[PDB]
């Protein structure tokens with residue numbers, strides 16, 4: 001798996017992408033790695049933000065499916081023409097697969113101006129595939145047509161330019177320290193899990209854990225932030241605020257309506273608490289917890305032209321769709337999407353940003369009763 005190490009790149013805030021090839025002869029493209037969706041979709045027309053795009057006319061192996069797809073989201077969309085073609089991952093396993101490709105022909109607020117990626121690799125399950133679950137996801141096609149074991153793992157580092165590794169079909173023990181702790185995939189649509197307890201600094205929010213997962217809790221490499229349902233966010237923030245009263249901050253800041261700025265190297269992190277999520281374990285009444293630092297929820301905003309200081313965002317926010325464990329969470333950990341056994345493994349990342357005081361941690365076992373009742377029906 002050393003072939004796959006460091007095979008992800010990116011810029012802060014713009015997501016992590018891997019190099020892929022499509023069609024014959026190979027067209028090289030940088031493709032966003034997204035565990036929060038299930039479509040393999042690539043730019044197929046000269047949108048001006050794009051370095052590159054899929055030229056189907058060049059590919060002997062391309063086959064039109066004579067069906068379109070339309071993918072709306074909040075303030076924007078993409079849409080395209082479905083087909084299949086041969087796909088490889090140069091710094092991945094040594095296979096070639098016939099995959100569904102959504103050739104993106106029109107879009108709105110999808111592509112990022114200044115980004116170096118041109119497509120998206122949805123790694124979640126068929127259930128949430130558009131237009132429907134009959135459209136087989138890439139990773140399904142990859143496993144079905146090859147002897148690649150049914151799992152992948154991600155080490156998202158983020159140092160500006162960010163970096164990481166997507167190990168396809170296996171686990172690289174060099175990417176983590178300590179032991180892997182596993183949480184069940186509640187259902188195969190998103191990578192859905194159950195949070196059973198939340199501690200800020202050690203103290204818990206004392207809320208009906210059912211809330212923590214209203215209506216979902218998911219692991220999503222395509223989201224930057226830790227999202228938290230309305231009520232959980234309220235209490236979450238209420239407590240982080242109390243942990244941090246040493247200095248005063250505006251209301252908008254907590255709502256991600258404004259950024260906060262300190263002077264160069266002048267923001268010791270200790271006015272902010274560590275945050276621990278307890279996840280459902282593999283065994284009845286057994287959990288484990290993952291602990292992240294404020295260096296995870298305080299993310300430097302890359303470049304602001306109207307300033308020169310240490311201006312971080314607050315990487316936590318509300319949600320109507322549920323908890324979303326994004327890069328704020330994932331960059332503390334090596335994460336193993338163990339699809340074969342329906343579970344996600346967390347371990348301390350060999351690359352997470354630690355200091356001389358505190359660290360990201362994964363610890364267990366803990367005893368937690370009624371973890372099932374934490375899941376919404």
Ligand SMILES: Cc1ccc(C)c(OC[C@@H](O)CN2CCOCC2)c1
Nearest residue numbers: 034035036037073110220222223324
């Ligand atoms: C790069 C990009 C552009 C547009 C959209 C809508 C993107 O979303 C990526 C998804 O993984 C978003 N998550 C949000 C949480 O729920 C699952 C989908 C990415």
